[PDB]
Amino acid sequence: EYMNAPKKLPADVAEELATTAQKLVQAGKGILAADESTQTIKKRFDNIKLENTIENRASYRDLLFGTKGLGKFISGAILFEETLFQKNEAGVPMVNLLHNENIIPGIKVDKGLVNIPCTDEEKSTQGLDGLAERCKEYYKAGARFAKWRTVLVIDTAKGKPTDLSIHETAWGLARYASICQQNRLVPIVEPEILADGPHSIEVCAVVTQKVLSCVFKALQENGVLLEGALLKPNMVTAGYECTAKTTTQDVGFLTVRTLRRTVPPALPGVVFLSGGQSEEEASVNLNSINALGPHPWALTFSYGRALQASVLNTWQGKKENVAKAREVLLQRAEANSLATYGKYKGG
Amino acid sequence: EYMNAPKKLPADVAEELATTAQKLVQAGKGILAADESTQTIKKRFDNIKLENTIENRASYRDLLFGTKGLGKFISGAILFEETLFQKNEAGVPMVNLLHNENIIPGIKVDKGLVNIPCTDEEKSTQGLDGLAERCKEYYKAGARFAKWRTVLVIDTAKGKPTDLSIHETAWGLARYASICQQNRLVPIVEPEILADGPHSIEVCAVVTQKVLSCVFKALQENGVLLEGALLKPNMVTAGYECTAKTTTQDVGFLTVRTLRRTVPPALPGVVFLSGGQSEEEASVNLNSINALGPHPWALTFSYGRALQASVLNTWQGKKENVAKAREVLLQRAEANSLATYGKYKGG
Amino acid sequence: EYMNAPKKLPADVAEELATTAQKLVQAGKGILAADESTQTIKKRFDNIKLENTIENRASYRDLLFGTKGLGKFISGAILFEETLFQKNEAGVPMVNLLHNENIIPGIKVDKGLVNIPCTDEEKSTQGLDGLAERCKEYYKAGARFAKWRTVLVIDTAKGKPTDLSIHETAWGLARYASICQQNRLVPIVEPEILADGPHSIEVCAVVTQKVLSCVFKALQENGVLLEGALLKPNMVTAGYECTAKTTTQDVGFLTVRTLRRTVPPALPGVVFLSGGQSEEEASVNLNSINALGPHPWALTFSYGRALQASVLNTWQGKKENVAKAREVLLQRAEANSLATYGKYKGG
Amino acid sequence: EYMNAPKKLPADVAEELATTAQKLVQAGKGILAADESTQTIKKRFDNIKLENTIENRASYRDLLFGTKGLGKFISGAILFEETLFQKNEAGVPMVNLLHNENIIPGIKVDKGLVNIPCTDEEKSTQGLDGLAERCKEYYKAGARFAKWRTVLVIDTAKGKPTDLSIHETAWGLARYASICQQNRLVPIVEPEILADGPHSIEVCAVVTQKVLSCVFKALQENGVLLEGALLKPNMVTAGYECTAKTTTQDVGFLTVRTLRRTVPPALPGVVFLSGGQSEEEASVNLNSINALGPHPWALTFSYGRALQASVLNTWQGKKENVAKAREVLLQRAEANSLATYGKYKGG
Amino acid sequence: AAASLYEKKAA
Amino acid sequence: AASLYEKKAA
Ligand SMILES: O=C(N/N=C/c1ccc(Cl)cc1Cl)c1ccc(O)c(O)c1
Ligand SMILES: O=C(N/N=C/c1ccc(Cl)cc1Cl)c1ccc(O)c(O)c1
Ligand SMILES: O=C(N/N=C/c1ccc(Cl)cc1Cl)c1ccc(O)c(O)c1
Ligand SMILES: O=C(N/N=C\c1ccc(Cl)cc1Cl)c1ccc(O)c(O)c1
């Protein structure tokens, strides 16, 4: 037997990971990213002038997961550690609300970002220490998939992202994925490349392709089962401060091209992050991507901002706005659901 | 611009390469590998008891390329340097016979195998020196795609293929590919892994997966356009001396699985080599592969042994048996052509 | 500026790290490894029939660091987290005992070993999460250098150590070393290869050479200042169950050859680990290494077993044997000190 | 046996390579680089208005190699293939003039530079095809060591040298050297980084470190005996069009520091190239390099321009100036010989 | 999956 | 000058 190679996973585990992965990217359904940390969700509550308490965080998550009919548009919901073991006013666990709509629970398992020495504030992700232990209790609590967020920056003048930034991100992601799969957690690999800067969309495609090539290389070296994994990349777009105007057709073409060159068909699906895009533009861009014919993998979504921005504004931390907010949620849920079909229009 | 990344090919060159590569793997067609060296063609003539003369090589190649209706099943024909500038007995250029059947002329551009120092007879492929100049030379002669054969050995006890063997082949294939693409020639990447040994089909799947991962990695680092290239790997099969017999369904599945895990969909097609397989088994196995539903890329053939073995025996160097042998060629060409649709049943 | 390269360290920081690194390998001096964990130091107290209390751990480390005249042979002492913030009977911190004896405080920063998925129980070291925060804490506590132990296994039949094992080890050590240097701590890189097995001494040399090549490779990609770092490898020896008899000069030859082939002279020194070697053989072998003339780097010791084994047996947890055991510590320290000069006779 | 590792060289061959490597860098000696191509040697005859003929080339090399007492300063002479089989006007083989002066014959074995596709005119060195066959013939012609020149460009704005440029250079050098050692020829690894550009000396130090780290990594992976190999790198200097004034001490320090961080002690010697430096600059700089104390390896010279410049003008293509020109050669040969001692002080 | 709209506007 | 290893090496 060829020894110098990553060993196989147990049959029972590999089959379960493959099944869950497919279910997470089933036709017309995406993932709800509601795993905002206590510090980030504070920012969202400040815009609506709401106190960041455990009472309101629970109430808001109850608003999202307690929405009937959401399961038709949402296959999975990513949770923060707090939410995973949290209950509403009625004492009903948030996970149970997801089970009622058959929405698969997911958990953010990384410990945030730290700067990489000998680099210009390029980030590294923490969370490897004791990850296996947390994966076991996360699985026991109901989670059937996990996420690990990494960040790269495009600064062509400073040569960003540098080789050190790329490989640290790549290897860190692969390490997290193999650990999750060992503990029966479907890993969502997120190599997010920020759109901050004046770089063109052509540059972003070059960077994204180079990064994704290094990521999947690290995955194969660590023995990550691609069949039981999902990719969470950024959409290939121009910079936020780029002068060259690019329509949704440019975004769709260069995103698909990048994905076809680096992502193996064994990967069941790819979930696009909304990033700093508006709710509408996130749906339009996603639609343009799937408008480009059928793909070997499922090109769906894992949105947070594009699914919660208008919901929060409708809610405003008021009980009498729950119904109006939950219907806005379903509207955005169905909107992005149609985008995966390549059949979403403005109005 | 990101700078620290392989530049892109000119729009004109990249477009022509993509067209040719796609046309080579068109529906129901494959590539005829008639590029045996002067040394290789001799031992094939010795089997039919025929002198390896300049006339005999020309007469035999004329038999293959003079077959009317061959273009129905054959899209491309790989030639040796000699045959490319040859004429038949009637003084008609060999490349013109292919043009009449509208079969794309191909050329072998490597210069054989040499031993890698500090390894156990592991092979390195030569031919990079003056490759760019020969590619221009071949292109003007009529070539539109090229090939480059590399060899790996599976020996579990000796750690074959070793790391050195893997990335030497990978980098050599990558270098050759970018050079050919720069000279308007579609490169056929052939990381041939020998089926010699008693290793199981599972071991072959592991080894092949590891090799292809490093092969494509080297391709990305050298800026090889996947859209304008083709892969020529082995079918994932057990060793010749392996005890645990594997049916053709096992060959088909573990071959597809390996490709889906490593080969990006940007690559238009995969042309399998016949290897040491018999003419019948090469057709059956190819059929089993395509019988596994529609694939992200084209899964056709680049055969030589599985297309010329019975042809030689029928011909036997005799001028009388030319027509009789050409009907054998079309029969074995159709058999493999039907295998691409997954509609070939031997009985 | 080249940009695509690990940025330089601040002049003041890099200057201090270079001073501490060279001072730890000062002529005739070595490092005392007294950073045993709770469960590790437990198995030591059990052998001499002693209860593993916090009083006994404090008392024992007080015996070591309170040894008058220890600074003549010991340049630095590696502590466990507990010991660093601990005080003896008199009320004097353990750190102050080292300060009075010209001994530089060191700290173990690794969080133990964890199996790598898809491998045969090959280990990986944890401790990156919050490492930078702990470094700042340790520095203010008195620590000036850190340690991080990784473990590799030689099993040629199973192809150990595999590439995944080697690279995870290398990159793990790489990240750790950069973080320490960022926070004014000299990193002791310890890629320990276990001598467990029947492998010959020639095999160990090839493996060690391969591992060290990858370790330093990973070190330079993260931009670790070699001038401010130290290496803690195993001596190139035959396996414990090996049958081929090897003399101490065979150990010295293949160790020096291995280091000269892999370790750049910028590294101020190399601190060997005793491993499973006896106290005497650890001194004899270290002597055999230094008997081969003045090396480009200081080849001294970072012993723990070879310095404390006989001390514990003499002490036996009784106050009446403290001074008696402290002399045993001094004669062992002097033994390995003379070994650095190559002037240590057998007895 | 570990299997997954480059095998060892035969004891007899590796031994000859080691002692030859030692002789080439004898104390107070260096290497005369007289391996100019028939076009490079043409531009030198254009400065002394001499016909670029085989007769003039013969008389010139005869002037250099026929010099008595040259062996006291010159340990080896690098030749072009023409000169290796060439005879003087008297009919005496050029290789015999070296033997009488105890100067070791050397041969340039690369086939020149070619552009790397998808790069901004970055160079790749050719000469691997049939390299093993040529080395066997050169060895029978008197050559004991070979030379392979690679070229890298520093341009921070364009990210030069790029990773593809660096890796292809490193892998090419490693490939050539393993073949030379296999054929009993000591390889001179020359990763020359051009001093063209306005970059500072700090930038050159960064790039050189990155290149050398990648170069030596490739040598290990190819299993090249460092004990029987030479490094021919550039001196760490600022660019020609740079504006930051630096002294010879700056060149000396940042060159030594770079080599100490990257070059293992196993490598017996490092032969610097004169480059675009003048005859006096190359000597003073080499003196400054060796003035920084004793080194783990031999830091001598492999000069061509710095040794033949004043010789050409003195000769003026006349027999009566032969005696006068040979003394100029000795004066400069001794000048650099004293520089290796670090005692050369012109004036 | 070898006949998408992306491929129909490429080759 | 050099180490004993280098002397015994070659
Ligand atoms: O050169 C070829 N085959 N020679 C194989 C061979 C012969 C003799 C020995 Cl001893 C070993 C070996 Cl591996 C060849 C060249 C181009 C092709 O398209 C092709 O299919 C084969
Ligand atoms: O704590 C250490 N090692 N743990 C050893 C160990 C524990 C458990 C089992 Cl099952 C086996 C083993 Cl070998 C340690 C501490 C400081 C050092 O400088 C060092 O080299 C090692
Ligand atoms: O000088 C060499 N090549 N030509 C370089 C060059 C390029 C452009 C211009 Cl304008 C001038 C020049 Cl000199 C050379 C040839 C062989 C060697 O072994 C060597 O060390 C150097
Ligand atoms: O709470 C999070 N912190 N992440 C950093 C972060 C947040 C927000 C802003 Cl504006 C910037 C930054 Cl760098 C988080 C956000 C999104 C996720 O998908 C997630 O899993 C976690």
Side-chain angles (χ1 to χ4, degrees), chain A residues 33 35-41 43-44 78 80 108 110 113 147 149 151 190 232 305:
Chain A
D35 63 317
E36 302 85 3
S37 63
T38 314
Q39 303 172 4
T40 302
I41 201 63
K43 302 159 52 187
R44 303 305 127 185
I78 313 179
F80 190 75
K108 168 188 173 66
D110 66 86
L113 296 178
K147 196 188 63 59
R149 186 178 177 269
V151 166
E190 182 183 355
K232 184 159 186 174
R305 170 181 290 269

PDB file of all heavy atoms in Angstrom, chain A residues 33 35-41 43-44 78 80 108 110 113 147 149 151 190 232 305, ligand 4:
ATOM      1  N   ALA A  33     -26.466  32.845   7.123  1.00  0.00           N
ATOM      2  CA  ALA A  33     -25.323  33.164   7.968  1.00  0.00           C
ATOM      3  C   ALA A  33     -25.734  34.093   9.103  1.00  0.00           C
ATOM      4  O   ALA A  33     -25.729  35.315   8.953  1.00  0.00           O
ATOM      5  CB  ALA A  33     -24.210  33.788   7.143  1.00  0.00           C
ATOM      6  N   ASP A  35     -24.257  33.897  12.242  1.00  0.00           N
ATOM      7  CA  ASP A  35     -23.245  33.596  13.245  1.00  0.00           C
ATOM      8  C   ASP A  35     -22.450  34.834  13.653  1.00  0.00           C
ATOM      9  O   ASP A  35     -21.257  34.745  13.947  1.00  0.00           O
ATOM     10  CB  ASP A  35     -22.292  32.517  12.727  1.00  0.00           C
ATOM     11  CG  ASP A  35     -21.517  32.963  11.503  1.00  0.00           C
ATOM     12  OD1 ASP A  35     -22.118  33.589  10.605  1.00  0.00           O
ATOM     13  OD2 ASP A  35     -20.301  32.692  11.444  1.00  0.00           O
ATOM     14  N   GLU A  36     -23.115  35.985  13.672  1.00  0.00           N
ATOM     15  CA  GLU A  36     -22.473  37.225  14.090  1.00  0.00           C
ATOM     16  C   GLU A  36     -22.042  37.140  15.548  1.00  0.00           C
ATOM     17  O   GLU A  36     -22.816  36.722  16.410  1.00  0.00           O
ATOM     18  CB  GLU A  36     -23.408  38.422  13.896  1.00  0.00           C
ATOM     19  CG  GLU A  36     -23.888  38.628  12.469  1.00  0.00           C
ATOM     20  CD  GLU A  36     -25.109  37.795  12.138  1.00  0.00           C
ATOM     21  OE1 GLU A  36     -25.615  37.096  13.042  1.00  0.00           O
ATOM     22  OE2 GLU A  36     -25.564  37.840  10.977  1.00  0.00           O
ATOM     23  N   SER A  37     -20.802  37.537  15.818  1.00  0.00           N
ATOM     24  CA  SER A  37     -20.280  37.539  17.179  1.00  0.00           C
ATOM     25  C   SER A  37     -20.970  38.609  18.015  1.00  0.00           C
ATOM     26  O   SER A  37     -21.725  39.426  17.490  1.00  0.00           O
ATOM     27  CB  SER A  37     -18.768  37.767  17.175  1.00  0.00           C
ATOM     28  OG  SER A  37     -18.448  39.042  16.645  1.00  0.00           O
ATOM     29  N   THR A  38     -20.703  38.601  19.318  1.00  0.00           N
ATOM     30  CA  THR A  38     -21.311  39.559  20.235  1.00  0.00           C
ATOM     31  C   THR A  38     -20.905  40.990  19.890  1.00  0.00           C
ATOM     32  O   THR A  38     -21.682  41.929  20.075  1.00  0.00           O
ATOM     33  CB  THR A  38     -20.919  39.264  21.695  1.00  0.00           C
ATOM     34  OG1 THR A  38     -21.057  37.861  21.957  1.00  0.00           O
ATOM     35  CG2 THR A  38     -21.801  40.047  22.658  1.00  0.00           C
ATOM     36  N   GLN A  39     -19.689  41.145  19.381  1.00  0.00           N
ATOM     37  CA  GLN A  39     -19.157  42.459  19.041  1.00  0.00           C
ATOM     38  C   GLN A  39     -19.699  42.963  17.704  1.00  0.00           C
ATOM     39  O   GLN A  39     -19.896  44.165  17.520  1.00  0.00           O
ATOM     40  CB  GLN A  39     -17.628  42.416  19.006  1.00  0.00           C
ATOM     41  CG  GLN A  39     -16.995  41.933  20.303  1.00  0.00           C
ATOM     42  CD  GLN A  39     -15.499  41.721  20.180  1.00  0.00           C
ATOM     43  OE1 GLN A  39     -14.902  42.008  19.142  1.00  0.00           O
ATOM     44  NE2 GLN A  39     -14.883  41.212  21.242  1.00  0.00           N
ATOM     45  N   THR A  40     -19.939  42.042  16.776  1.00  0.00           N
ATOM     46  CA  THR A  40     -20.444  42.402  15.454  1.00  0.00           C
ATOM     47  C   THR A  40     -21.950  42.646  15.477  1.00  0.00           C
ATOM     48  O   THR A  40     -22.448  43.577  14.845  1.00  0.00           O
ATOM     49  CB  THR A  40     -20.128  41.310  14.414  1.00  0.00           C
ATOM     50  OG1 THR A  40     -18.713  41.092  14.364  1.00  0.00           O
ATOM     51  CG2 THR A  40     -20.621  41.722  13.034  1.00  0.00           C
ATOM     52  N   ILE A  41     -22.671  41.806  16.213  1.00  0.00           N
ATOM     53  CA  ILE A  41     -24.118  41.940  16.324  1.00  0.00           C
ATOM     54  C   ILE A  41     -24.474  43.205  17.106  1.00  0.00           C
ATOM     55  O   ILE A  41     -25.598  43.700  17.030  1.00  0.00           O
ATOM     56  CB  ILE A  41     -24.754  40.704  17.001  1.00  0.00           C
ATOM     57  CG1 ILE A  41     -26.239  40.597  16.648  1.00  0.00           C
ATOM     58  CG2 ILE A  41     -24.544  40.741  18.508  1.00  0.00           C
ATOM     59  CD1 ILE A  41     -26.498  40.385  15.173  1.00  0.00           C
ATOM     60  N   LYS A  43     -22.954  46.056  16.531  1.00  0.00           N
ATOM     61  CA  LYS A  43     -22.950  47.060  15.474  1.00  0.00           C
ATOM     62  C   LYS A  43     -24.299  47.118  14.766  1.00  0.00           C
ATOM     63  O   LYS A  43     -24.773  48.192  14.398  1.00  0.00           O
ATOM     64  CB  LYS A  43     -21.844  46.761  14.460  1.00  0.00           C
ATOM     65  CG  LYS A  43     -20.446  46.703  15.052  1.00  0.00           C
ATOM     66  CD  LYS A  43     -19.507  45.911  14.151  1.00  0.00           C
ATOM     67  CE  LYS A  43     -19.545  46.423  12.718  1.00  0.00           C
ATOM     68  NZ  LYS A  43     -18.770  45.549  11.793  1.00  0.00           N
ATOM     69  N   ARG A  44     -24.910  45.952  14.580  1.00  0.00           N
ATOM     70  CA  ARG A  44     -26.189  45.856  13.888  1.00  0.00           C
ATOM     71  C   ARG A  44     -27.331  46.367  14.760  1.00  0.00           C
ATOM     72  O   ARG A  44     -28.322  46.895  14.255  1.00  0.00           O
ATOM     73  CB  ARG A  44     -26.455  44.412  13.460  1.00  0.00           C
ATOM     74  CG  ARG A  44     -25.364  43.822  12.581  1.00  0.00           C
ATOM     75  CD  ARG A  44     -25.118  44.693  11.361  1.00  0.00           C
ATOM     76  NE  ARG A  44     -23.708  45.041  11.214  1.00  0.00           N
ATOM     77  CZ  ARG A  44     -23.236  45.866  10.284  1.00  0.00           C
ATOM     78  NH1 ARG A  44     -24.063  46.431   9.415  1.00  0.00           N
ATOM     79  NH2 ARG A  44     -21.937  46.125  10.223  1.00  0.00           N
ATOM     80  N   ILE A  78     -26.099  28.988   9.958  1.00  0.00           N
ATOM     81  CA  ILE A  78     -24.866  29.038  10.735  1.00  0.00           C
ATOM     82  C   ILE A  78     -25.081  29.808  12.035  1.00  0.00           C
ATOM     83  O   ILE A  78     -25.598  30.924  12.025  1.00  0.00           O
ATOM     84  CB  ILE A  78     -23.720  29.690   9.940  1.00  0.00           C
ATOM     85  CG1 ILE A  78     -23.646  29.099   8.531  1.00  0.00           C
ATOM     86  CG2 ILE A  78     -22.397  29.513  10.668  1.00  0.00           C
ATOM     87  CD1 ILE A  78     -22.561  29.708   7.672  1.00  0.00           C
ATOM     88  N   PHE A  80     -23.707  31.176  16.064  1.00  0.00           N
ATOM     89  CA  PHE A  80     -22.620  31.490  16.981  1.00  0.00           C
ATOM     90  C   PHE A  80     -22.724  30.518  18.150  1.00  0.00           C
ATOM     91  O   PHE A  80     -23.762  29.884  18.334  1.00  0.00           O
ATOM     92  CB  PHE A  80     -22.698  32.944  17.451  1.00  0.00           C
ATOM     93  CG  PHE A  80     -21.483  33.411  18.205  1.00  0.00           C
ATOM     94  CD1 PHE A  80     -20.303  33.695  17.538  1.00  0.00           C
ATOM     95  CD2 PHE A  80     -21.527  33.579  19.581  1.00  0.00           C
ATOM     96  CE1 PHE A  80     -19.186  34.128  18.228  1.00  0.00           C
ATOM     97  CE2 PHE A  80     -20.413  34.013  20.276  1.00  0.00           C
ATOM     98  CZ  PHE A  80     -19.240  34.287  19.599  1.00  0.00           C
ATOM     99  N   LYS A 108     -20.106  28.386  13.820  1.00  0.00           N
ATOM    100  CA  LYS A 108     -18.831  29.057  13.601  1.00  0.00           C
ATOM    101  C   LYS A 108     -17.826  28.562  14.637  1.00  0.00           C
ATOM    102  O   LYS A 108     -18.067  28.676  15.838  1.00  0.00           O
ATOM    103  CB  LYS A 108     -19.007  30.574  13.685  1.00  0.00           C
ATOM    104  CG  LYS A 108     -17.718  31.373  13.760  1.00  0.00           C
ATOM    105  CD  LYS A 108     -18.019  32.837  14.050  1.00  0.00           C
ATOM    106  CE  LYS A 108     -16.750  33.632  14.307  1.00  0.00           C
ATOM    107  NZ  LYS A 108     -15.889  33.719  13.097  1.00  0.00           N
ATOM    108  N   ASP A 110     -14.202  29.116  14.463  1.00  0.00           N
ATOM    109  CA  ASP A 110     -12.922  29.816  14.516  1.00  0.00           C
ATOM    110  C   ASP A 110     -12.908  30.830  15.656  1.00  0.00           C
ATOM    111  O   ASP A 110     -13.962  31.219  16.164  1.00  0.00           O
ATOM    112  CB  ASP A 110     -12.619  30.506  13.185  1.00  0.00           C
ATOM    113  CG  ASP A 110     -13.584  31.631  12.876  1.00  0.00           C
ATOM    114  OD1 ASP A 110     -13.342  32.768  13.334  1.00  0.00           O
ATOM    115  OD2 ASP A 110     -14.582  31.380  12.168  1.00  0.00           O
ATOM    116  N   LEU A 113      -9.469  36.678  14.134  1.00  0.00           N
ATOM    117  CA  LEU A 113      -8.260  36.949  13.364  1.00  0.00           C
ATOM    118  C   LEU A 113      -7.134  37.550  14.196  1.00  0.00           C
ATOM    119  O   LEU A 113      -7.371  38.328  15.120  1.00  0.00           O
ATOM    120  CB  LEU A 113      -8.579  37.887  12.201  1.00  0.00           C
ATOM    121  CG  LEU A 113      -9.530  37.338  11.141  1.00  0.00           C
ATOM    122  CD1 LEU A 113      -9.793  38.387  10.075  1.00  0.00           C
ATOM    123  CD2 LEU A 113      -8.952  36.073  10.529  1.00  0.00           C
ATOM    124  N   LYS A 147     -18.062  26.342  10.095  1.00  0.00           N
ATOM    125  CA  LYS A 147     -17.448  27.366   9.256  1.00  0.00           C
ATOM    126  C   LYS A 147     -16.180  27.942   9.891  1.00  0.00           C
ATOM    127  O   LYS A 147     -16.067  28.029  11.114  1.00  0.00           O
ATOM    128  CB  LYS A 147     -18.445  28.490   8.971  1.00  0.00           C
ATOM    129  CG  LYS A 147     -18.042  29.383   7.807  1.00  0.00           C
ATOM    130  CD  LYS A 147     -18.960  30.579   7.685  1.00  0.00           C
ATOM    131  CE  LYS A 147     -18.857  31.461   8.909  1.00  0.00           C
ATOM    132  NZ  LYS A 147     -17.469  31.957   9.116  1.00  0.00           N
ATOM    133  N   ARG A 149     -13.701  31.286   9.048  1.00  0.00           N
ATOM    134  CA  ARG A 149     -13.510  32.466   8.210  1.00  0.00           C
ATOM    135  C   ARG A 149     -12.060  32.940   8.169  1.00  0.00           C
ATOM    136  O   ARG A 149     -11.422  33.117   9.207  1.00  0.00           O
ATOM    137  CB  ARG A 149     -14.409  33.610   8.688  1.00  0.00           C
ATOM    138  CG  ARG A 149     -14.379  34.842   7.793  1.00  0.00           C
ATOM    139  CD  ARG A 149     -15.321  35.921   8.306  1.00  0.00           C
ATOM    140  NE  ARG A 149     -15.262  37.138   7.501  1.00  0.00           N
ATOM    141  CZ  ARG A 149     -14.442  38.155   7.744  1.00  0.00           C
ATOM    142  NH1 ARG A 149     -13.604  38.101   8.771  1.00  0.00           N
ATOM    143  NH2 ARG A 149     -14.457  39.225   6.961  1.00  0.00           N
ATOM    144  N   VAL A 151      -9.319  35.822   5.972  1.00  0.00           N
ATOM    145  CA  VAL A 151      -9.344  37.083   5.237  1.00  0.00           C
ATOM    146  C   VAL A 151      -8.033  37.379   4.512  1.00  0.00           C
ATOM    147  O   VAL A 151      -6.954  37.332   5.107  1.00  0.00           O
ATOM    148  CB  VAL A 151      -9.669  38.264   6.178  1.00  0.00           C
ATOM    149  CG1 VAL A 151      -9.370  39.594   5.504  1.00  0.00           C
ATOM    150  CG2 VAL A 151     -11.119  38.204   6.614  1.00  0.00           C
ATOM    151  N   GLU A 190     -13.867  28.995   4.006  1.00  0.00           N
ATOM    152  CA  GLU A 190     -14.093  30.382   3.615  1.00  0.00           C
ATOM    153  C   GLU A 190     -12.793  31.175   3.484  1.00  0.00           C
ATOM    154  O   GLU A 190     -12.278  31.702   4.471  1.00  0.00           O
ATOM    155  CB  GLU A 190     -15.019  31.073   4.620  1.00  0.00           C
ATOM    156  CG  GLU A 190     -15.344  32.517   4.263  1.00  0.00           C
ATOM    157  CD  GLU A 190     -16.203  33.202   5.308  1.00  0.00           C
ATOM    158  OE1 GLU A 190     -16.632  32.525   6.268  1.00  0.00           O
ATOM    159  OE2 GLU A 190     -16.446  34.419   5.170  1.00  0.00           O
ATOM    160  N   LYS A 232     -16.686  28.574   0.555  1.00  0.00           N
ATOM    161  CA  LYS A 232     -17.314  29.868   0.804  1.00  0.00           C
ATOM    162  C   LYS A 232     -16.405  31.006   0.345  1.00  0.00           C
ATOM    163  O   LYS A 232     -15.715  31.627   1.154  1.00  0.00           O
ATOM    164  CB  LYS A 232     -17.655  30.016   2.289  1.00  0.00           C
ATOM    165  CG  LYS A 232     -18.407  31.285   2.642  1.00  0.00           C
ATOM    166  CD  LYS A 232     -19.139  31.142   3.965  1.00  0.00           C
ATOM    167  CE  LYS A 232     -20.012  32.353   4.241  1.00  0.00           C
ATOM    168  NZ  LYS A 232     -20.845  32.164   5.459  1.00  0.00           N
ATOM    169  N   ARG A 305     -25.680  39.692   5.521  1.00  0.00           N
ATOM    170  CA  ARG A 305     -26.119  41.063   5.285  1.00  0.00           C
ATOM    171  C   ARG A 305     -27.279  41.121   4.296  1.00  0.00           C
ATOM    172  O   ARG A 305     -28.249  41.849   4.505  1.00  0.00           O
ATOM    173  CB  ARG A 305     -24.958  41.918   4.771  1.00  0.00           C
ATOM    174  CG  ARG A 305     -25.379  43.290   4.262  1.00  0.00           C
ATOM    175  CD  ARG A 305     -24.192  44.091   3.752  1.00  0.00           C
ATOM    176  NE  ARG A 305     -23.313  44.521   4.834  1.00  0.00           N
ATOM    177  CZ  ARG A 305     -23.435  45.676   5.481  1.00  0.00           C
ATOM    178  NH1 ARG A 305     -24.404  46.519   5.155  1.00  0.00           N
ATOM    179  NH2 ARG A 305     -22.590  45.986   6.454  1.00  0.00           N
TER     180      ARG A 305
HETATM  181  O1  LIG G   4     -18.543  38.495  13.924  1.00  0.00           O
HETATM  182  C1  LIG G   4     -17.792  38.328  12.982  1.00  0.00           C
HETATM  183  N1  LIG G   4     -16.491  38.920  12.977  1.00  0.00           N
HETATM  184  N2  LIG G   4     -15.721  38.682  11.832  1.00  0.00           N
HETATM  185  C2  LIG G   4     -14.899  39.799  11.451  1.00  0.00           C
HETATM  186  C3  LIG G   4     -15.640  41.048  10.951  1.00  0.00           C
HETATM  187  C4  LIG G   4     -16.996  41.247  11.161  1.00  0.00           C
HETATM  188  C5  LIG G   4     -17.617  42.406  10.709  1.00  0.00           C
HETATM  189  C6  LIG G   4     -16.881  43.377  10.048  1.00  0.00           C
HETATM  190 CL1  LIG G   4     -17.667  44.831   9.483  1.00  0.00          CL
HETATM  191  C7  LIG G   4     -15.526  43.187   9.842  1.00  0.00           C
HETATM  192  C8  LIG G   4     -14.905  42.029  10.292  1.00  0.00           C
HETATM  193 CL2  LIG G   4     -13.199  41.808  10.022  1.00  0.00          CL
HETATM  194  C9  LIG G   4     -18.244  37.486  11.785  1.00  0.00           C
HETATM  195  C10 LIG G   4     -18.726  38.130  10.659  1.00  0.00           C
HETATM  196  C11 LIG G   4     -19.144  37.382   9.565  1.00  0.00           C
HETATM  197  C12 LIG G   4     -19.084  35.999   9.597  1.00  0.00           C
HETATM  198  O2  LIG G   4     -19.516  35.254   8.477  1.00  0.00           O
HETATM  199  C13 LIG G   4     -18.599  35.354  10.725  1.00  0.00           C
HETATM  200  O3  LIG G   4     -18.535  33.949  10.753  1.00  0.00           O
HETATM  201  C14 LIG G   4     -18.176  36.099  11.824  1.00  0.00           C
END
